[PDB]
Structure formats: structure tokens, C-alpha cells
Design an enzyme around this catalytic site. Structure first.
Site, PDB file in Angstrom:
ATOM      1  N   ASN A   1     -31.145  32.720  30.022  1.00  0.00           N
ATOM      2  CA  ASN A   1     -31.493  32.664  31.453  1.00  0.00           C
ATOM      3  C   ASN A   1     -30.920  31.431  32.207  1.00  0.00           C
ATOM      4  O   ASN A   1     -31.429  31.032  33.264  1.00  0.00           O
ATOM      5  CB  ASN A   1     -33.016  32.866  31.689  1.00  0.00           C
ATOM      6  CG  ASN A   1     -33.906  31.843  30.974  1.00  0.00           C
ATOM      7  OD1 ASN A   1     -33.471  31.092  30.105  1.00  0.00           O
ATOM      8  ND2 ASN A   1     -35.176  31.835  31.340  1.00  0.00           N
TER       9      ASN A   1
ATOM     10  N   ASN B   1     -31.325  28.501  32.216  1.00  0.00           N
ATOM     11  CA  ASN B   1     -32.438  27.741  32.778  1.00  0.00           C
ATOM     12  C   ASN B   1     -32.582  26.366  32.165  1.00  0.00           C
ATOM     13  O   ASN B   1     -33.513  25.642  32.507  1.00  0.00           O
ATOM     14  CB  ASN B   1     -33.738  28.498  32.539  1.00  0.00           C
ATOM     15  CG  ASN B   1     -34.258  28.314  31.127  1.00  0.00           C
ATOM     16  OD1 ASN B   1     -33.499  28.401  30.159  1.00  0.00           O
ATOM     17  ND2 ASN B   1     -35.553  28.022  31.003  1.00  0.00           N
TER      18      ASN B   1
ATOM     19  N   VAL C   1     -33.286  25.469  29.004  1.00  0.00           N
ATOM     20  CA  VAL C   1     -34.159  25.420  27.831  1.00  0.00           C
ATOM     21  C   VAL C   1     -33.753  26.518  26.855  1.00  0.00           C
ATOM     22  O   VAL C   1     -33.720  27.692  27.228  1.00  0.00           O
ATOM     23  CB  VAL C   1     -35.629  25.651  28.243  1.00  0.00           C
ATOM     24  CG1 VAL C   1     -36.532  25.767  27.023  1.00  0.00           C
ATOM     25  CG2 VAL C   1     -36.108  24.532  29.152  1.00  0.00           C
TER      26      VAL C   1
ATOM     27  N   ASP D   1     -39.644  32.440   8.532  1.00  0.00           N
ATOM     28  CA  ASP D   1     -39.361  33.849   8.263  1.00  0.00           C
ATOM     29  C   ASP D   1     -40.440  34.809   8.754  1.00  0.00           C
ATOM     30  O   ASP D   1     -40.128  35.800   9.434  1.00  0.00           O
ATOM     31  CB  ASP D   1     -39.073  34.069   6.767  1.00  0.00           C
ATOM     32  CG  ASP D   1     -37.688  33.548   6.359  1.00  0.00           C
ATOM     33  OD1 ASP D   1     -36.843  33.278   7.249  1.00  0.00           O
ATOM     34  OD2 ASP D   1     -37.439  33.403   5.146  1.00  0.00           O
TER      35      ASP D   1
ATOM     36  N   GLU E   1     -42.643  24.236  -2.585  1.00  0.00           N
ATOM     37  CA  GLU E   1     -42.370  24.439  -1.160  1.00  0.00           C
ATOM     38  C   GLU E   1     -43.569  24.192  -0.245  1.00  0.00           C
ATOM     39  O   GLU E   1     -43.437  23.514   0.780  1.00  0.00           O
ATOM     40  CB  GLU E   1     -41.778  25.842  -0.914  1.00  0.00           C
ATOM     41  CG  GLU E   1     -40.420  26.063  -1.579  1.00  0.00           C
ATOM     42  CD  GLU E   1     -39.699  27.341  -1.148  1.00  0.00           C
ATOM     43  OE1 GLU E   1     -40.012  27.919  -0.085  1.00  0.00           O
ATOM     44  OE2 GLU E   1     -38.781  27.776  -1.874  1.00  0.00           O
TER      45      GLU E   1
HETATM   46  O1  LIG Z   1     -28.461  33.437   3.238  1.00  0.00           O
HETATM   47  C1  LIG Z   1     -29.226  33.350   4.444  1.00  0.00           C
HETATM   48  C2  LIG Z   1     -30.622  32.802   4.151  1.00  0.00           C
HETATM   49  O2  LIG Z   1     -30.569  31.889   3.050  1.00  0.00           O
HETATM   50  C3  LIG Z   1     -31.843  31.367   2.648  1.00  0.00           C
HETATM   51  O3  LIG Z   1     -32.723  32.395   2.184  1.00  0.00           O
HETATM   52  C4  LIG Z   1     -32.414  32.861   0.870  1.00  0.00           C
HETATM   53  C5  LIG Z   1     -33.091  34.215   0.762  1.00  0.00           C
HETATM   54  O4  LIG Z   1     -32.170  35.201   0.280  1.00  0.00           O
HETATM   55  C6  LIG Z   1     -32.757  36.516   0.257  1.00  0.00           C
HETATM   56  O5  LIG Z   1     -33.196  36.937   1.567  1.00  0.00           O
HETATM   57  C7  LIG Z   1     -33.951  36.498  -0.707  1.00  0.00           C
HETATM   58  O6  LIG Z   1     -34.481  37.825  -0.914  1.00  0.00           O
HETATM   59  C8  LIG Z   1     -35.003  35.512  -0.185  1.00  0.00           C
HETATM   60  O7  LIG Z   1     -36.155  35.462  -1.028  1.00  0.00           O
HETATM   61  C9  LIG Z   1     -34.340  34.142  -0.119  1.00  0.00           C
HETATM   62  O8  LIG Z   1     -35.248  33.188   0.427  1.00  0.00           O
HETATM   63  C10 LIG Z   1     -32.536  30.681   3.811  1.00  0.00           C
HETATM   64  O9  LIG Z   1     -33.841  30.316   3.384  1.00  0.00           O
HETATM   65  C11 LIG Z   1     -32.619  31.597   5.024  1.00  0.00           C
HETATM   66  O10 LIG Z   1     -33.169  30.887   6.140  1.00  0.00           O
HETATM   67  C12 LIG Z   1     -31.233  32.114   5.371  1.00  0.00           C
HETATM   68  O11 LIG Z   1     -30.429  31.019   5.815  1.00  0.00           O
HETATM   69 CA   LIG Z   2     -33.780  29.650  28.368  1.00  0.00          CA
END
Ligand SMILES: OC[C@H]1O[C@H](OC[C@H]2O[C@H](O)[C@H](O)[C@@H](O)[C@@H]2O)[C@H](O)[C@@H](O)[C@H]1O
Ligand SMILES: [Ca+2]
Length: 760
Positions: free
Chosen positions: A433, A435, A437, A501, A727
């Protein structure tokens, strides 16, 4: 001193499978890597491994695969009689040590690292009579297991017929040759990789298929030397011989180098005197972990980098992400500043340039994922390399922490232009947009759209799939809303780009929870994140945005402008600095005014509603999807006003909100989508935790942060055990979860040590 810190992490174990995976597909052991080398070693756990450092872990470009349980295990014989030893084995920062004690013979083995491809074993034998030395070893046969239990009866050679592993004798030891295997998600070898063993004395070698015996004679006490080297290219193999010769010719120099490298890490690192011994050992776990994840140049990556976890399933090799990089380099600037600078350089070494042959419209873009093998689109056969999205940018903060520690003006001059192009790209390609941001989003890509630039998407219902194209069709299909689910590769990629995610704020929420949301008077539509496309004035597609502006994202942009202003002032650019201060000022005004809800006293994302509000805000705060850590991002990045921050701290410290068994989780208890064991909808991550503690501190609440730090310390499971760093934590119970040796938990555990942990 290193000796004070024995067995910080449990590094024992005898691998039985190439993929000796734990429950989440991570190698369930913790090998010792150093100097960026592409192999690592475990300690022996008992009689069958005693005399060797088991578990040769090979880094096959992008993955961790075990080679052998036993490989080069010493056994000692006097007058045809086997000497019986008892075992002490331990790790220290920078080395594995094992001692074998017996009546007439004693052995001291110390394994350290010499070069980025070569580790050095010192075998110190003490004896009053001559001796016969036997080393043995055996390559692995079985393929895959989970929690110790086999998943199949699959063999390594069955699975990879062209691997053709072959143990071979040499003039001063032996070596293992590996055939070419391009298993894109599993195992990657050039065709000329090797594991070379070189010894300081002549040996006699017997090869029996995939196992070996080696023998030698000594007259009495003597210290002998061995090199172990995993080498991935023909060119590496040649260029190492020379360096092996210099190691065996002067081992003490190399021991001393390592020995000293690590005393300096621990010296520069452990700088909080208020910290307890327990807390100081957590800090050292982090330093070990972080250093282990450091990889030297390899394949397409011309710099030293640091990955999220060397034992991770998808985080190994030299696979590098910008997000965790910033957090890693912020911490490692306080102890291994050389490699912190390189990690940053590595991420920016594939920043998009004018005239790029893939995405000339993405100038300044920093890829999500770089690795040994480039994508087919760039000439290689890599499946991981990814330019579907970037990740959240704390680059300027991380670069400014290295300068804070080192005071190197030339570092700032090196980085400034790289950062300015990244900043500029956000505004051009992530501000649907116009804008000012940003939104999170995705790039133009094979996976996101046709060659006409028409966005791909798949509609699902029951057992029926229907792939279509175009934003026109997408809008309609959403209005009708006659699907069970709607998969948009471009939108999938913006969740990556968000850094989270499964997040509530991006519309993710389980049946049962959504049902209760409706029963409480919500509408399902409230959880639908719309999606749009970004086009230049020329009509060129540049990428995509979420039709939603995230408060963390805006806060990171404030930081970016903040730090770019300081960097500019340091480099004698007063007018470029004034402009960045002004952009920063506009972002704080927009964040406070548009994203802070006075009613619930907290910050939130905003929708880009079909028409903007009277106050310039693209939409109203998305309060109905609950609270989360992004709420205190304006406090951390310093966007918040004292008053708004006062309110946010009230919420943070509330037991019914974020102040839980383990505090500052990734969704409040009052979130509609909350789940204690859900990664991004309840579980505590240490970075968010720490962003929060820093945030309180910045607005006068240091003593409150110190309290929470003490709570985190008493409650977060295993923190003072010898298990690998993972994690996240369940906020109610403390259970850990996620990959062992997780860098950014180490980064931020280390900084919790540096800032907030103390004697209670
Ligand atoms: O490759 C892109 C992705 O890389 C990292 O995630 C790895 C993931 O790969 C598969 O999706 C698998 O099934 C997952 O369990 C695993 O975390 C990163 O964490 C993502 O943000 C993205 O960059
Ligand atoms: Ca924006």
C-alpha cells in the site's frame, strides 16, 4: 580455563545407523566439531568403544551422516596378552579427552582440531616395556533408526548403490573413498570425497571388506600423532596433503593453537561476575554449541558461516538462514567475533545484484536459505537453496553489536551499503500500500506463479484438488469460501518469511479452538489472512504481501532505521542519517498510533483493510486473534512510548497472560488459538523471551526482568543438565522440544547469562 568445564554436553554414544535419528529426525548424539571442519567425533561410553573416539560424523555438504561406530580404536598387547584398561572419557571446551589406566601401561588420548578439514589425535603411551599396538575399525551397514530402534532393515549400500565405499591402505595409514551420490534430501557426495587417516609411525594394515585391522610396534613410552580428515573435493584432497605434513611435523604448534583459541573464547565470553557456576556452565554450553555449528567455506558458500544445528535434519551442512544468523552473530560477537563477522558476510554474499539472471527485480534481497549446492535455477542440483522469501531483518542490530564489541570502523563501512540495499528492497517489494510500513510476503518464483506472473493456488475439498491461477480467481474463491483448505505457495512462503510457522496472528487455529471462538461470538472470517500482489508502476510483478502489517516487522524496521542512522553518523554521512532518523520517527508514530489498542493495553498486527482509516492506519489492530510476543517487539526495538510500554509490561507480568511457569511464551493464555505444546501458539522461545526482557529493561523495568530470568532459570527443563540445547519450552510444564544443539537458543541462553542471570 577449559578443565573447569568437563562434559558440559553429553557427547558419548556408539552410532549403529547412518541416520541414527531421535524422535524428530535429528542425529541423537552430539559430535565434537571445531574450526568449521566437516567431520566430528563422539566419546566412548564403555568397553566396546574404549581406545577410540567413536561415531565419525560426516558432513556431506548439506547433511550429517555417520560413517562408522568404531574407527581407529586402539587396543594394547604385551607379550601376546591384551592389556585391560579402565576408562575416563570427557569433553572440554575445544577438545575430547580419554585416559586408559592399567598396571604397567597408561594411555592419554587428546583429540583437537588443526584445520577446517583435519582433526588431530595425540596418543600418549607410557610403558616400561615394548608394546604391540592394534587399531581397528568398521564402517556402518544399517541405514536408519529412530530412538535407537530401526525403522527398516535397509542397508546403506542397498540404499545407495553408487556409494561404493572402499577402505584402502596407504603409505602412512589408510583412507575411505566415496562414490558420487546426489540424494538431494539425504546424502550428497561429489564423487571424490574421502576420509583420510595419517599416522606418525609406520603401520601394517589388513582390510577385510568394510572393516580394518592395523598393527605397529613401539619400544616403550612414546607420544604418537594421527590426523583424521574428511575432504569433499579432489581439490581439497590435494590441497590438504601439504597441511597434514606440517601437522605431523609440528603437532604441538597445532595443539597449542587450539588450546589457546579456546582459552580466549572462554576469557572473552564469561564476563558476568554475578553469574553462578551453574549459570556460567550454561553460558559455556552455548559457546560450545555455537562454535560446533560454525562451518568453514564449503561449496557455493565462500565464507565461514553458522547453521541452526549441525545435528539437525534440515539445519546441517553449511545451510544458512539470515534470521538466526543475526541472533547468532549478536552473541558470537561477544566471544568469537571473527566468525560472527563471517556469518553475516555469508548471508550477504548472495544478496541480489543489479542484472541478476533470476530475479533482477529483487535487488537487495537476502535469500532465505543458502547452502553448498545452488538451486537448479542457478546451476547446481540443490533442493534446499531458497529464494521464495527472505526472513525478518535484524541485520543492522547484529552488525552494530559486532562494532560495539570491536570498535572496527571498517566493519561498518563494509556492511552499510549491503544493509542499505536490503532496507531499500523491503520498501520497494514489501509495501503493497506504498504507506511506508512493511508486510511479510514472498518473491516471484517458479513455485508461486506462472510465467505470465499469474499467482498459483490449489483449492481443496474432501478428496478433491483444483489448481488454478490469478489473483482475480483467488479473490472470488475466497469470497465464496467453498473449500476445506486453500494452499497458496506464495502465502506459505510468507509464513516462512514471518519467522513463525503455525502462528495465531497469521490465521492458524485448530478446529476445536476455532469452534469455541465462534461459540464465544466470533466469525470464522476473522482468521482469514488475505493476500495480494506487488507490482511496479511499469506493471512488473515484484512479489507478494500479506494484506496485514505485522507489529514485529514494523518494529524491526524501526531498529533497522535506528541503527542505519548511527552507522551513517559513524561513516560521516550526516544527511543520510537524518533521513533514517525521520523514517524511524514515522514508524514509531505509525506503530504507537495504529497498532496499539488502548482497550486491552497491548500491541497487535493490523489488517490492510479494503480502505484505510481516518488516521492513516491501513486497518485496525487484529485484537480478536489474541496476544503474542510481537506485542512487546515495539518495547524491544524501542518504538514504544513510555506509557504504552508501561501497559505492555503490566500484561507481560500478569499470571493470566504471559507470566507463566516459563514466562513470555509465543501466545498468551487468553489467546483463542493458545496451545501449551504448540510451537508458535504457546511455547516459549528464548529469543522472544530475551527480546521481552530487554524490552522491559529499556523502559525501566530491569528488576522485573531479573525476576523473570530467575523464574526461567529455576523452571525451564534441563537447563543445568548435560543435554543439548533445544528449540522451545512448554510454558506450563517446562518440557523442552525441538532440535538438539539449536543455535539461536544458544545465542540467547548465552545473552541471558550476559545480561539477566545472577546469584539469587
Ligand atoms: O527450506 C525452507 C525452510 O527451511 C527451514 O525449515 C526446514 C523445514 O523443512 C521441511 O518443511 C520440514 O518438513 C520441516 O520440519 C523443517 O522445519 C526453516 O525453518 C523455514 O523457515 C524455511 O526457511
Ligand atoms: Ca504497508
Amino acid at each position: 580455563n577449559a578443565d573447569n568445564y568437563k562434559n558440559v554436553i553429553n557427547r558419548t554414544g556408539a552410532p549403529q545407523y547412518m541416520k541414527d535419528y531421535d524422535y524428530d529426525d535429528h542425529q541423537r548424539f552430539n559430535p565434537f566439531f571445531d574450526l568449521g571442519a566437516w567431520h566430528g567425533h563422539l566419546l566412548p561410553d564403555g568397553p566396546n568403544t574404549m581406545g577410540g573416539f567413536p561415531g565419525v560424523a560426516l558432513l556431506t555438504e548439506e547433511y550429517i551422516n555417520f560413517m562408522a561406530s568404531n574407527f581407529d580404536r586402539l587396543t594394547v598387547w604385551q607379550d601376546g596378552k591384551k592389556v585391560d584398561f579402565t576408562l575416563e572419557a570427557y569433553s572440554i571446551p575445544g577438545a575430547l579427552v580419554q585416559k586408559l589406566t592399567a598396571k604397567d601401561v597408561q594411555v592419554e588420548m587428546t583429540l583437537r582440531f588443526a584445520t577446517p578439514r583435519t582433526s588431530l589425535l595425540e596418543t600418549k603411551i607410557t610403558s616400561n616395556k615394548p608394546l604391540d599396538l592394534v587399531w581397528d575399525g568398521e564402517l556402518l551397514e544399517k541405514l536408519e533408526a529412530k530412538e535407537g530402534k530401526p525403522l527398516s532393515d535397509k542397508t546403506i549400500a542397498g540404499e545407495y548403490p553408487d556409494y561404493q565405499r572402499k577402505i584402502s591402505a596407504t603409505r602412512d595409514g589408510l583412507k575411505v573413498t566415496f562414490g558420487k551420490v546426489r540424494a538431494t534430501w539425504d546424502l550428497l557426495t561429489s564423487g571424490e570425497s574421502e576420509y583420510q587417516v595419517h599416522k606418525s609411525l609406520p603401520v601394517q594394515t589388513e582390510i577385510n571388506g568394510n572393516r580394518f585391522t592395523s598393527k605397529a610396534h613401539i619400544n616403550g613410552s612414546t607420544t604418537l600423532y594421527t590426523t583424521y580428515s574428511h575432504l569433499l573435493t579432489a581439490q581439497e584432497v590435494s590441497k590438504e596433503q601439504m597441511q597434514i605434513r606440517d601437522i605431523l611435523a609440528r603437532p604441538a604448534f597445532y595443539l597449542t593453537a587450539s588450546q589457546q583459541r579456546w582459552e580466549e573464547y572462554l576469557k572473552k565470553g564469561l564476563t558476568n561476575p554475578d553469574a553462578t557456576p551453574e549459570q556460567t556452565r550454561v553460558a559455556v554450553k552455548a559457546i560450545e554449541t555455537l562454535n560446533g555449528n560454525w562451518r568453514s567455506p564449503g561449496g557455493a558458500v565462500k565464507f565461514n558461516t553458522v547453521t541452526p544445528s549441525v545435528t539437525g535434519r534440515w539445519f546441517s551442512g553449511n545451510q544458512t538462514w539470515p534470521w538466526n544468523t543475526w541472533k547468532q552473530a549478536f552473541a558470537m560477537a561477544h566471544f568469537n567475533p571473527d566468525i560472527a563477522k563471517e556469518n553475516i558476510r555469508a548471508v550477504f554474499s548472495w544478496q541480489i545484484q543489479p542484472g541478476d539472471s533470476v530475479r533482477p527485480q529483487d535487488v537487495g534481497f537476502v535469500p532465505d536459505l543458502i547452502a553448498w549446492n545452488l538451486s537448479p535455477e542457478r546451476g547446481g542440483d540443490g533442493g534446499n537453496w531458497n529464494e521464495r522469501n527472505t526472513k525478518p531483518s535484524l541485520a543492522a542490530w547484529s552488525v552494530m553489536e559486532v562494532y560495539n564489541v570491536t570498535q572496527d570502523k571498517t566493519w561498518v563501512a563494509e556492511m552499510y551499503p549491503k544493509l542499505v540495499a536490503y532496507h531499500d528492497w523491503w520498501l520497494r517489494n514489501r509495501d503493497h500500500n506504498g504507506n511506508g510500513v512493511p508486510e511479510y510476503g514472498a518473491t516471484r518464483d517458479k513455485a508461486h506463479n506462472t510465467e505470465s506472473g499469474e499467482m498459483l493456488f490449489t483449492v481443496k475439498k474432501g478428496d478433491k484438488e483444483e489448481t488454478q491461477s490469478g489473483l482475480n480467481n483467488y479473490a472470488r474463491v475466497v469470497e465464496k469460501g467453498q473449500y476445506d483448505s486453500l494452499e497458496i505457495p506464495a502465502q506459505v512462503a510468507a509464513s516462512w518469511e514471518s519467522g513463525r510457522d503455525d502462528a495465531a496472528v497469521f490465521g492458524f487455529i485448530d478446529k476445536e479452538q476455532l469452534d469455541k471462538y465462534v461459540a464465544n461470538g466470533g466469525k470464522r472470517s476473522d482468521w482469514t489472512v488475505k493476500f495480494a500482489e506487488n507490482r511496479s508502476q511499469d506493471g512488473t510483478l515484484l512479489g507478494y504481501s500479506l494484506l496485514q502489517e505485522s507489529v514485529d516487522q514494523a518494529s524491526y524496521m524501526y531498529s533497522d532505521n535506528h541503527y542505519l542512522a548511527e552507522m551513517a553518523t559513524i561513516l560521516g554521512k550526516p544527511e543520510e542519517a537524518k533521513r533514517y532518523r525521520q523514517l524511524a520517527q514515522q514508524l514509531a508514530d505509525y506503530i504507537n498510533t495504529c497498532m496499539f489498542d488502548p482497550t486491552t493495553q497491548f500491541y497487535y498486527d493490523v489488517r490492510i483493510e479494503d480502505k484505510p482509516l481516518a488516521n492513516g492506519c491501513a486497518g485496525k489492530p487484529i485484537v480478536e486473534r489474541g496476544k503474542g510476543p510481537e506485542g512487546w517487539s515495539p518495547l524491544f526495538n524501542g518504538a514504544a512510548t513510555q506509557a504504552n510500554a508501561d501497559a505492555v509490561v503490566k500484561v507481560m507480568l500478569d499470571p493470566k497472560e504471559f507470566n507463566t511457569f516459563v514466562p513470555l511464551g509465543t501466545a498468551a493464555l487468553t489467546n483463542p488459538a493458545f496451545g501449551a505444546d504448540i510451537y508458535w501458539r504457546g511455547r516459549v522461545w528464548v529469543d522472544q523471551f530475551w527480546f521481552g526482557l530487554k524490552g522491559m529493561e529499556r523502559y525501566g523495568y530491569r528488576d522485573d526482568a531479573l525476576k523473570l530470568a530467575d523464574t526461567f532459570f529455576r523452571h525451564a527443563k534441563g537447563l543445568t543438565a548435560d543435554g543439548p540445547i533445544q528449540e522451545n519450552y512448554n510454558p506450563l510444564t517446562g518440557a523442552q522440544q525441538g532440535a538438539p544443539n539449536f543455535s539461536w537458543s544458544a545465542a540467547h541462553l548465552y545473552m541471558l547469562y550476559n545480561d539477566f542471570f545472577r546469584k539469587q
